Amino acid sequence: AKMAFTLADRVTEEMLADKAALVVEVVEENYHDAPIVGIAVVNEHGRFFLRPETALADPQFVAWLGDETKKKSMFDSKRAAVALKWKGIELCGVSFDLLLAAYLLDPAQGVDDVAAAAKMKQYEAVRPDEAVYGKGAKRAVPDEPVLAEHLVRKAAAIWELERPFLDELRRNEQDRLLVELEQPLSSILAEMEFAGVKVDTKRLEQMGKELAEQLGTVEQRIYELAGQEFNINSPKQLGVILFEKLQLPVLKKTKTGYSTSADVLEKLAPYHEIVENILHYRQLGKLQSTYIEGLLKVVRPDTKKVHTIFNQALTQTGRLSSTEPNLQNIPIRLEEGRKIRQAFVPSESDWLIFAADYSQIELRVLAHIAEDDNLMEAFRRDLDIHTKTAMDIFQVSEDEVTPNMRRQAKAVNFGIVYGISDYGLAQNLNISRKEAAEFIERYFESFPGVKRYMENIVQEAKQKGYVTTLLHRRRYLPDITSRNFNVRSFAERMAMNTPIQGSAADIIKKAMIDLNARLKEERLQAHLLLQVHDELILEAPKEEMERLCRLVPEVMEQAVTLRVPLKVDYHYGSTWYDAK
DNA sequence: GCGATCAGCCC
DNA sequence: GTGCTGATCGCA
Ligand SMILES: Nc1ccn([C@H]2C[C@H](O)[C@@H](COP(=O)(O)OP(=O)(O)OP(=O)(O)O)O2)c(=O)n1
Ligand SMILES: OC[C@H]1O[C@@](CO)(O[C@H]2O[C@H](CO)[C@@H](O)[C@H](O)[C@H]2O)[C@@H](O)[C@@H]1O
Ligand SMILES: OC[C@H]1O[C@@](CO)(O[C@H]2O[C@H](CO)[C@@H](O)[C@H](O)[C@H]2O)[C@@H](O)[C@@H]1O
Ligand SMILES: [Mg+2]
């Protein structure tokens, strides 16, 4: 039964009520400078469809969009806000975002369109976007009659679903999480994405030619050491060369065949000179194809900026993710790849990059939630946590901690957070389970509070069916009762790790909101560019660095109040690389 | 063209 | 523990 609506040729006062479900459709996955194909509005007066060229040129409509007293309910308001920013139009007054609401109610549903959200409440009078637009090479905007009905049905669903979703969020004690954290954050991310990050393409291109030369030398050497040419980028062909022609021992296999992972190769290095060159080739090739060519592909030719898109409704822990490009995995550990960061520069002359990062926020959060006396005292003394853990599990004085002992203690600390397992640790430390388990038992002996938390949180997950973070983010764990050991164990690790990683996510999100407000009150030109899980990257006039050195760490350290202090380190320079 | 595999980068 | 990307491969 078709849905009734007015396919308007002009904008009327009736369409500008102070409460409405609004749809500003952007079909392209990457919404930066992308087309708005249609508009739909549903309010107390009816349902309307408006052509973009018409509405967006209407002075009254544009004013309505930018009036914060005129409330709008939408799905993925950031997409619409950014597409509008590229057209010089401000979107204000978004009081409800169905995507973010659905995300908070259950991140596991993977809601990515209105239909999926509506299905959560048995509402099915709307089609999935993929059904209307198709996918891949077949993707396409349908004729006006089909498009208009779809957009109106989406607006209609949003209009109907707002109350039931808000009611459930309220029952879950998550309504403030939506209204005071995620929605305000959505507007901040929109600003960051739109601003973009300036890239020194000349610098990137120069590095690219250096690697092209280095890869050519190592490539030929590999063929030389192998006695023939083959596709190194082919694990299949590489395996034949290594485990058949050169007879290297098979230490590990994959579902399909021989493993050629870096971890395995390192062990085979002693047997043949070719292995070292394969490792080098893998290093250079990764930088060339992924960080040089891949980054250059998404830089905008006119402005030389990259405009990432932060997916705010994807991770099961509350973290943000980044795409096109993913600016959350730019090399830094290895010096060769770290140089890539010299390519990210300030967008204005005489401006600099400022970066601030939380120091061990996950372990501090664990100290707080577990109320472990030993761990809390360690952070109150601001001790090197890995050295301290080594002293405790190995029963030695600070002076007796060797470099290897600290390395292994650090591995134990990472596991503890990321759901400890006498299997993942061993594999990571190149040791056995019995041994790894011995380290774990020693850890819990030194940190009994953490042991109690791990036991209690798993019990809570089983009883309630989910675990929660500091700001009430939730994650359901139905597999916690599984009779399959591996399936159940993974759920148990999630029960232990989500409150830690998730609370850390809550904190940095609140810090971003607090910082944006402080920068405005202070009348500073500085602004946020990126977020990388536990760090914030900004750019600003060189004349504002001194003020930022005091302001940013303070705002981040005071975002929330825990049983232990929060610590923030900071640096600034002419490029992202120098902000070290 | 498209999806399963493999690999490797970040926190 | 959470993510995103690129080169191969054989399939359609
Ligand atoms: N109705 C609610 C209540 C809480 N929360 C989430 C976000 C809040 O920041 C957090 C803590 O809620 P509290 O009830 O503890 O309120 P505050 O912690 O904000 O106030 P108080 O200092 O009284 O604890 O839980 C929410 O989303 N919706
Ligand atoms: O606008 C981002 C928002 O849209 C979703 C779908 O509702 O993801 C789409 O857009 C992303 C950005 O280009 C793509 O990575 C993704 O593949 C596409 O489906 C949400 O997941 C996201 O929160
Ligand atoms: O010269 C291209 C040609 O070489 C092969 C093997 O001889 O692959 C080599 O070059 C590719 C492009 O740089 C790499 O991806 C690959 O790892 C390297 O061995 C052929 O497959 C290709 O047609
Ligand atoms: Mg850090």
XYZ file of C-alpha atoms (C1' of nucleotides) and ligand atoms in Angstrom:
678
model
C 0.000 0.000 0.000
C 1.762 3.112 -1.322
C 2.483 5.922 1.131
C 0.857 9.301 0.532
C 2.932 12.444 0.164
C 3.256 15.707 -1.722
C 5.882 15.906 -4.457
C 6.285 19.687 -4.142
C 7.636 22.051 -6.792
C 8.086 24.863 -4.268
C 8.755 25.243 -0.536
C 5.798 26.181 1.678
C 5.486 27.378 5.282
C 3.838 24.052 6.135
C 7.160 22.326 5.469
C 8.988 24.485 8.007
C 7.407 23.417 11.326
C 9.555 23.457 14.482
C 9.634 19.645 14.688
C 10.233 17.248 11.814
C 11.875 14.086 10.506
C 14.310 15.189 7.792
C 16.051 13.232 5.043
C 18.859 14.837 2.997
C 19.917 11.926 0.796
C 23.551 11.433 -0.235
C 23.961 8.140 -2.091
C 27.726 8.167 -2.707
C 29.416 6.243 0.121
C 32.022 8.976 0.446
C 29.884 12.067 1.070
C 32.601 14.721 0.705
C 31.583 17.251 -1.977
C 28.984 14.666 -3.051
C 25.543 15.167 -4.650
C 22.372 15.510 -2.586
C 19.836 13.574 -4.697
C 16.617 14.353 -2.857
C 14.985 15.718 0.275
C 12.021 14.537 2.353
C 10.269 16.113 5.320
C 7.628 14.584 7.573
C 5.964 16.709 10.239
C 2.577 17.323 11.865
C 1.277 18.772 8.585
C 2.133 15.863 6.307
C 4.844 14.223 4.205
C 6.774 16.093 1.521
C 9.378 15.424 -1.168
C 11.530 18.286 -2.465
C 14.032 18.348 -5.310
C 17.459 19.502 -4.043
C 18.089 22.190 -6.661
C 14.794 23.694 -5.476
C 14.964 23.457 -1.680
C 18.646 24.322 -1.356
C 18.130 27.504 -3.384
C 15.141 28.542 -1.281
C 16.091 31.251 1.269
C 13.365 30.147 3.683
C 14.356 26.469 3.542
C 18.046 27.238 4.060
C 17.158 29.441 7.036
C 15.003 26.648 8.496
C 17.892 24.176 8.137
C 20.227 26.483 10.050
C 17.787 27.457 12.826
C 18.661 25.557 16.005
C 15.179 26.168 17.439
C 13.663 24.151 14.576
C 14.217 20.535 15.660
C 15.039 17.755 13.205
C 15.095 13.966 13.622
C 17.396 12.175 11.174
C 19.475 9.073 10.386
C 23.251 9.740 10.045
C 23.040 13.505 10.417
C 26.824 13.834 10.006
C 26.596 12.647 6.385
C 23.981 15.321 5.626
C 25.777 18.014 7.630
C 29.058 17.459 5.785
C 27.470 17.277 2.316
C 25.760 20.566 3.165
C 28.992 22.156 4.466
C 30.551 21.574 1.041
C 27.636 23.579 -0.404
C 28.031 26.397 2.119
C 24.899 25.465 4.069
C 24.735 25.024 7.859
C 22.560 22.291 9.404
C 21.473 22.938 13.007
C 18.852 21.688 15.432
C 19.346 17.945 15.042
C 17.830 16.639 18.282
C 17.683 12.935 17.386
C 19.884 10.693 15.208
C 18.422 7.205 14.668
C 21.760 5.710 13.555
C 23.508 6.725 16.780
C 20.454 5.682 18.837
C 20.424 2.220 17.261
C 24.206 1.976 17.691
C 24.008 2.619 21.447
C 21.118 0.167 21.956
C 23.104 -2.658 20.350
C 26.366 -2.130 18.395
C 26.254 -5.791 17.314
C 23.236 -5.351 15.047
C 25.427 -3.539 12.539
C 22.643 -1.102 11.693
C 23.672 0.826 8.582
C 20.356 1.995 7.135
C 16.935 3.098 8.335
C 15.306 -0.234 7.484
C 17.725 -2.111 9.747
C 17.003 0.234 12.653
C 13.259 0.018 12.065
C 13.378 -3.790 12.105
C 14.543 -3.572 15.740
C 11.025 -2.385 16.613
C 9.070 -4.572 14.162
C 8.573 -1.664 11.721
C 8.939 -2.874 8.132
C 7.174 -0.274 5.967
C 10.492 0.883 4.480
C 12.948 -0.799 2.081
C 16.697 -1.386 2.699
C 18.860 1.155 0.833
C 20.654 -1.627 -1.067
C 17.319 -2.853 -2.432
C 16.561 0.593 -3.849
C 20.019 1.675 -5.066
C 21.602 -1.709 -5.741
C 25.323 -2.214 -5.111
C 28.700 -2.230 -6.827
C 28.790 -1.587 -10.568
C 24.990 -1.765 -10.555
C 24.637 0.998 -7.958
C 22.421 3.805 -9.250
C 19.845 6.413 -8.262
C 16.357 5.323 -9.435
C 13.742 7.442 -11.235
C 12.043 10.218 -9.238
C 8.847 8.268 -8.420
C 10.827 5.422 -6.846
C 13.352 7.718 -5.161
C 10.700 10.024 -3.711
C 8.651 7.214 -2.165
C 11.771 5.699 -0.608
C 12.980 8.956 0.953
C 9.482 9.694 2.273
C 9.209 6.183 3.760
C 12.572 6.700 5.504
C 11.430 10.031 6.939
C 8.163 8.404 8.010
C 10.007 5.612 9.839
C 12.246 8.118 11.628
C 9.155 10.127 12.653
C 7.511 7.017 14.119
C 10.609 5.449 15.698
C 11.958 8.411 17.686
C 9.805 7.870 20.778
C 10.233 4.085 21.117
C 14.010 4.389 20.703
C 14.296 7.247 23.202
C 12.117 5.264 25.631
C 14.387 2.203 25.505
C 17.518 4.343 25.795
C 15.963 5.927 28.895
C 15.239 2.484 30.392
C 18.886 1.546 29.706
C 20.038 4.812 31.323
C 21.640 5.750 28.000
C 19.592 8.807 27.018
C 22.276 11.252 28.216
C 24.916 9.177 26.404
C 23.026 9.909 23.167
C 22.026 13.531 23.804
C 25.073 14.830 25.705
C 27.886 12.746 24.172
C 27.363 11.050 20.784
C 25.137 13.647 19.085
C 27.252 16.663 20.100
C 30.339 14.663 19.082
C 28.790 13.993 15.671
C 28.845 17.732 14.934
C 32.497 17.981 16.011
C 33.530 15.080 13.771
C 31.696 16.749 10.860
C 33.839 19.865 11.367
C 37.054 17.822 11.547
C 36.239 15.841 8.394
C 35.269 18.965 6.464
C 38.441 20.798 7.562
C 40.642 17.965 6.364
C 44.401 17.608 6.726
C 46.892 19.247 4.360
C 49.307 16.891 2.627
C 52.749 17.711 1.200
C 52.309 15.712 -2.005
C 55.748 16.694 -3.310
C 57.284 15.122 -0.208
C 55.237 11.934 -0.677
C 56.155 11.682 -4.360
C 59.863 12.040 -3.569
C 59.706 9.254 -0.997
C 57.826 7.205 -3.554
C 60.674 7.376 -6.055
C 63.207 6.472 -3.360
C 61.278 3.299 -2.528
C 60.749 2.439 -6.192
C 64.537 2.328 -6.523
C 65.122 0.398 -3.296
C 62.418 -2.138 -4.185
C 64.039 -2.678 -7.567
C 67.382 -3.561 -6.005
C 65.946 -5.940 -3.405
C 63.564 -7.426 -5.977
C 66.413 -8.420 -8.298
C 68.465 -9.750 -5.388
C 65.552 -11.984 -4.414
C 65.344 -13.452 -7.920
C 69.108 -13.848 -7.721
C 69.026 -15.740 -4.421
C 66.070 -17.785 -5.687
C 67.601 -18.566 -9.068
C 64.468 -17.436 -10.895
C 61.773 -14.766 -11.048
C 58.356 -15.114 -9.419
C 55.660 -12.923 -7.878
C 56.858 -12.144 -4.356
C 53.463 -10.591 -3.551
C 51.987 -14.049 -4.069
C 52.126 -16.117 -0.861
C 51.297 -19.057 -3.120
C 54.307 -18.625 -5.413
C 56.528 -17.475 -2.554
C 55.707 -20.620 -0.601
C 56.767 -22.860 -3.481
C 60.126 -21.087 -3.692
C 60.784 -21.237 0.058
C 59.391 -24.584 1.197
C 59.895 -26.603 -1.976
C 62.794 -25.212 -4.018
C 64.882 -24.054 -1.039
C 63.598 -26.728 1.342
C 63.130 -24.386 4.295
C 61.324 -26.020 7.246
C 57.557 -25.549 7.560
C 57.007 -24.146 11.051
C 53.420 -23.060 10.450
C 50.709 -23.530 7.840
C 47.564 -21.691 6.797
C 44.160 -23.026 5.761
C 45.242 -22.739 2.112
C 48.922 -23.678 2.335
C 52.277 -22.507 3.694
C 52.519 -19.489 5.998
C 54.864 -16.678 4.946
C 54.016 -14.183 7.683
C 56.788 -11.933 9.013
C 56.734 -13.786 12.338
C 57.528 -17.070 10.582
C 60.095 -15.622 8.173
C 62.117 -14.145 11.040
C 62.594 -17.699 12.333
C 63.726 -18.911 8.902
C 66.278 -16.126 8.407
C 69.168 -18.225 9.788
C 68.638 -20.831 7.056
C 68.876 -18.713 3.911
C 69.880 -15.185 2.878
C 66.759 -14.856 0.734
C 64.578 -14.601 3.850
C 66.106 -11.315 4.994
C 65.528 -9.756 1.570
C 61.901 -10.972 1.540
C 61.347 -9.227 4.863
C 62.890 -6.014 3.544
C 60.797 -6.241 0.367
C 57.647 -6.687 2.461
C 58.581 -3.584 4.462
C 59.183 -1.311 1.478
C 56.289 -2.680 -0.560
C 53.862 -2.049 2.286
C 54.918 1.607 2.451
C 54.867 2.079 -1.324
C 51.496 0.515 -2.126
C 49.603 1.396 1.059
C 50.992 4.677 2.404
C 52.430 6.397 -0.663
C 50.247 5.388 -3.605
C 47.204 4.780 -1.414
C 47.369 8.181 0.266
C 48.060 10.056 -2.979
C 44.932 8.498 -4.485
C 42.620 10.241 -2.014
C 44.257 13.671 -1.769
C 42.085 16.400 -3.318
C 44.043 17.909 -6.289
C 42.749 21.429 -5.784
C 43.408 21.834 -2.049
C 45.912 19.022 -1.469
C 43.941 17.889 1.585
C 42.615 14.492 2.668
C 39.113 14.379 4.167
C 38.735 11.166 6.156
C 35.350 9.883 7.297
C 35.053 8.838 10.932
C 32.627 5.941 11.320
C 30.950 6.755 14.637
C 28.610 3.730 14.631
C 30.747 0.685 13.900
C 33.032 -0.667 16.656
C 31.652 -2.926 19.368
C 33.669 -1.044 22.010
C 32.736 2.580 21.358
C 35.919 3.533 19.523
C 35.798 5.551 16.305
C 37.178 4.080 13.050
C 38.602 6.016 10.084
C 38.377 5.462 6.316
C 39.397 6.936 2.951
C 41.963 7.389 4.174
C 42.387 5.463 7.395
C 44.441 8.019 9.314
C 44.491 5.870 12.436
C 47.202 3.507 11.216
C 49.910 5.768 9.786
C 53.340 4.179 10.518
C 55.322 5.316 13.558
C 56.961 2.287 15.212
C 59.616 1.856 12.514
C 61.646 4.937 11.560
C 61.489 4.214 7.823
C 57.698 4.272 7.763
C 57.499 6.971 10.424
C 58.926 9.432 7.900
C 55.538 9.208 6.167
C 54.190 11.599 8.804
C 56.407 14.409 7.530
C 53.888 14.601 4.668
C 51.077 15.752 6.981
C 51.390 19.503 7.523
C 49.459 22.560 8.824
C 46.845 23.979 6.445
C 48.064 27.576 6.836
C 51.410 29.338 6.775
C 52.959 29.892 10.205
C 50.648 27.303 11.788
C 51.866 24.177 13.588
C 50.660 20.660 14.486
C 49.901 19.975 18.182
C 49.389 16.393 19.409
C 48.309 15.280 22.897
C 48.000 11.658 24.028
C 46.810 9.924 27.186
C 49.539 7.938 28.920
C 48.334 4.379 29.693
C 44.661 5.361 29.865
C 43.453 1.734 29.630
C 45.548 0.546 32.583
C 44.496 3.608 34.605
C 40.857 2.827 33.804
C 41.452 -0.774 34.938
C 42.970 0.490 38.204
C 39.844 2.584 38.733
C 37.188 -0.031 37.931
C 38.940 -2.895 39.743
C 39.920 -0.683 42.695
C 43.176 -2.608 42.877
C 45.228 -1.116 45.717
C 48.610 -2.012 44.183
C 47.788 -0.747 40.682
C 46.168 2.461 41.962
C 49.207 3.205 44.147
C 51.497 2.604 41.168
C 49.703 5.255 39.121
C 49.462 7.657 42.076
C 53.284 7.526 42.159
C 53.308 7.853 38.340
C 55.655 4.857 38.129
C 56.757 3.213 34.894
C 53.961 0.621 34.863
C 55.850 -2.030 32.872
C 58.910 -1.875 35.136
C 56.606 -2.023 38.170
C 54.776 -5.077 36.800
C 58.130 -6.760 36.157
C 59.276 -6.108 39.734
C 56.095 -7.720 41.038
C 55.692 -10.794 38.831
C 59.421 -11.598 38.885
C 59.929 -10.597 42.535
C 62.949 -8.324 42.044
C 63.983 -4.751 42.864
C 63.795 -1.933 40.317
C 67.555 -2.157 39.722
C 67.253 -5.863 38.933
C 64.736 -5.442 36.112
C 66.496 -6.298 32.858
C 65.359 -5.073 29.420
C 63.934 -8.513 28.569
C 62.021 -8.683 31.860
C 60.372 -5.329 31.126
C 59.532 -6.462 27.586
C 57.751 -9.547 28.888
C 55.982 -7.606 31.650
C 54.731 -5.173 29.016
C 53.335 -8.091 27.018
C 51.522 -9.340 30.110
C 50.004 -5.885 30.627
C 48.686 -5.737 27.059
C 47.121 -9.166 27.376
C 45.487 -8.323 30.705
C 43.637 -5.463 29.030
C 42.902 -7.221 25.731
C 41.298 -10.204 27.455
C 44.068 -12.357 28.913
C 44.523 -15.938 27.678
C 47.269 -18.477 28.393
C 47.287 -19.004 24.624
C 47.486 -15.530 23.116
C 50.266 -14.494 25.492
C 52.498 -17.506 24.795
C 52.089 -17.078 21.040
C 53.018 -13.421 21.503
C 56.056 -14.100 23.703
C 57.171 -17.104 21.649
C 56.719 -19.358 24.675
C 54.433 -22.187 25.826
C 51.014 -22.010 27.479
C 52.098 -23.611 30.748
C 54.721 -20.862 30.965
C 52.452 -18.023 29.850
C 49.886 -19.254 32.366
C 52.604 -19.085 35.015
C 53.110 -15.387 34.251
C 49.364 -14.783 34.484
C 49.017 -16.494 37.863
C 51.919 -14.397 39.144
C 50.241 -11.237 37.878
C 46.960 -11.955 39.669
C 48.933 -12.644 42.847
C 50.395 -9.131 42.710
C 47.134 -7.504 41.606
C 44.316 -9.324 43.490
C 41.876 -6.505 42.761
C 42.261 -7.046 39.019
C 41.789 -10.783 39.512
C 38.560 -10.151 41.435
C 37.316 -7.792 38.696
C 37.984 -10.324 35.937
C 36.060 -13.008 37.831
C 33.208 -10.668 38.766
C 32.766 -9.087 35.333
C 32.408 -12.487 33.647
C 29.798 -13.455 36.249
C 27.971 -10.156 35.670
C 27.942 -10.667 31.885
C 26.354 -14.076 32.353
C 23.743 -12.779 34.811
C 22.721 -9.592 32.994
C 23.548 -10.636 29.430
C 25.823 -7.634 28.802
C 28.618 -5.446 30.235
C 28.756 -1.637 30.480
C 31.285 1.205 30.391
C 31.776 4.285 32.579
C 29.244 6.329 30.585
C 26.782 3.437 30.182
C 27.726 2.203 26.723
C 26.586 -1.437 26.453
C 27.690 -4.663 24.749
C 25.600 -7.852 24.768
C 27.499 -11.142 25.055
C 25.080 -13.987 24.211
C 28.036 -16.360 23.643
C 29.015 -16.148 27.316
C 26.855 -19.244 27.949
C 28.097 -21.215 24.927
C 29.078 -24.845 25.471
C 31.846 -24.419 22.892
C 35.060 -23.611 24.753
C 36.614 -21.285 22.160
C 33.359 -19.417 21.507
C 32.686 -19.000 25.230
C 36.269 -17.974 25.987
C 36.197 -15.196 23.391
C 32.997 -13.830 24.933
C 34.677 -13.929 28.348
C 37.631 -11.945 27.014
C 35.146 -9.409 25.585
C 33.441 -9.147 28.972
C 36.789 -8.350 30.559
C 38.073 -5.985 27.858
C 35.034 -3.955 26.802
C 34.583 -2.006 30.062
C 38.274 -1.039 29.804
C 38.598 -0.125 26.110
C 35.040 1.219 26.077
C 35.464 3.477 29.101
C 38.671 4.827 27.540
C 36.606 5.574 24.404
C 33.962 7.369 26.492
C 36.622 9.537 28.142
C 38.351 10.745 24.995
C 34.971 11.476 23.364
C 33.976 13.655 26.316
C 37.404 15.298 26.230
C 36.823 16.248 22.584
C 33.527 17.899 23.469
C 35.028 19.712 26.486
C 38.011 20.870 24.408
C 35.898 22.222 21.547
C 33.915 24.305 24.066
C 37.046 25.621 25.787
C 38.710 26.590 22.497
C 35.605 28.637 21.630
C 35.396 30.374 25.032
C 39.095 31.248 24.727
C 38.599 32.586 21.194
C 41.460 30.421 19.888
C 41.829 29.636 16.184
C 43.200 26.187 16.997
C 40.989 23.290 15.962
C 40.828 19.507 16.017
C 42.009 17.570 12.972
C 42.139 13.915 14.033
C 41.596 11.452 16.866
C 43.576 8.196 17.102
C 41.990 6.227 19.964
C 43.984 7.751 22.816
C 45.282 10.919 21.185
C 43.991 14.184 19.744
C 45.735 16.020 16.887
C 45.126 19.741 16.305
C 46.605 22.541 14.205
C 46.874 26.209 15.173
C 48.785 29.503 14.757
C 52.322 29.282 16.104
C 51.315 32.119 18.440
C 48.874 29.807 20.263
C 51.258 26.956 21.149
C 52.112 28.240 24.616
C 48.447 28.532 25.550
C 47.650 25.095 24.094
C 50.451 23.470 26.100
C 48.514 24.331 29.253
C 44.942 24.162 28.000
C 44.773 20.895 26.074
C 46.340 18.563 28.665
C 44.237 20.129 31.429
C 40.954 19.662 29.558
C 41.853 16.057 28.695
C 43.029 15.269 32.227
C 39.819 16.674 33.720
C 37.322 15.060 31.304
C 36.272 12.628 34.035
C 37.391 12.079 37.627
C 38.831 8.647 38.432
C 40.391 7.078 41.532
C 43.776 7.646 39.881
C 45.021 10.703 37.964
C 44.829 10.845 34.177
C 48.104 11.851 32.498
C 48.512 13.505 29.100
C 51.738 14.005 27.143
C 52.021 16.568 24.353
C 54.298 17.765 21.543
C 54.118 20.157 18.587
C 56.055 20.865 15.397
C 55.989 21.836 11.723
C 54.658 18.421 10.635
C 52.818 15.528 12.280
C 56.198 13.753 12.382
C 57.753 16.551 14.442
C 54.873 16.635 16.899
C 57.030 14.199 18.886
C 33.431 -7.472 -11.515
C 33.462 -9.643 -6.930
C 34.519 -12.138 -2.725
C 37.760 -15.326 -0.157
C 42.727 -15.235 1.476
C 46.616 -13.512 2.813
C 49.496 -10.009 4.621
C 50.743 -5.846 7.793
C 49.890 -1.070 9.773
C 47.862 1.403 14.132
C 46.158 1.767 19.482
C 41.468 -7.062 22.318
C 39.533 -3.498 18.591
C 39.992 -1.656 13.378
C 41.145 -0.724 7.458
C 43.828 -1.466 3.468
C 46.154 -3.649 -0.729
C 47.816 -7.665 -3.918
C 46.403 -12.334 -5.455
C 43.508 -15.734 -6.755
C 39.777 -18.081 -9.184
C 35.183 -17.403 -9.706
C 31.309 -15.459 -12.503
N 19.717 8.788 32.272
C 21.013 8.574 32.058
C 21.892 8.473 33.143
C 23.253 8.237 32.913
N 23.749 8.097 31.590
C 25.199 7.819 31.345
C 25.908 9.123 30.951
C 26.262 9.715 32.284
O 27.362 10.615 32.132
C 26.703 8.501 33.075
C 26.666 8.717 34.590
O 25.331 8.975 35.039
P 25.048 9.371 36.575
O 23.675 8.946 36.935
O 26.170 8.899 37.426
O 25.084 10.998 36.529
P 26.468 11.867 36.614
O 27.417 10.763 36.832
O 26.311 12.612 35.338
O 25.939 12.687 37.918
P 26.341 12.230 39.422
O 27.637 13.139 39.733
O 25.258 12.622 40.354
O 26.784 10.812 39.412
O 25.831 7.415 32.622
C 22.860 8.201 30.495
O 23.271 8.079 29.345
N 21.493 8.440 30.736
O 28.230 8.110 6.656
C 28.921 7.126 7.417
C 27.896 6.142 8.017
O 27.248 5.449 6.919
C 27.394 4.015 7.057
C 26.064 3.392 6.528
O 24.907 3.892 7.212
O 28.538 3.631 6.219
C 28.640 4.020 4.805
O 29.625 5.111 4.644
C 31.018 4.852 5.072
C 31.819 6.138 4.767
O 32.125 6.239 3.379
C 31.580 3.557 4.368
O 32.835 3.155 4.919
C 30.588 2.364 4.523
O 31.027 1.279 3.719
C 29.100 2.816 3.931
O 28.200 1.717 4.074
C 27.644 3.799 8.560
O 28.343 2.588 8.863
C 28.456 5.035 8.952
O 28.326 5.312 10.346
O 57.261 -6.638 -13.652
C 55.920 -7.004 -13.345
C 55.789 -8.542 -13.352
O 56.704 -9.087 -12.366
C 56.048 -10.088 -11.537
C 57.065 -11.267 -11.380
O 58.100 -11.280 -12.376
O 55.785 -9.443 -10.232
C 56.742 -8.502 -9.619
O 56.283 -7.110 -9.798
C 54.971 -6.733 -9.219
C 54.756 -5.234 -9.537
O 55.749 -4.416 -8.914
C 54.930 -7.079 -7.682
O 53.616 -6.933 -7.135
C 55.391 -8.550 -7.430
O 55.536 -8.774 -6.033
C 56.899 -8.768 -8.093
O 57.307 -10.110 -7.853
C 54.764 -10.447 -12.321
O 53.689 -10.942 -11.517
C 54.403 -9.123 -12.989
O 53.531 -9.326 -14.098
Mg 49.849 7.009 24.475
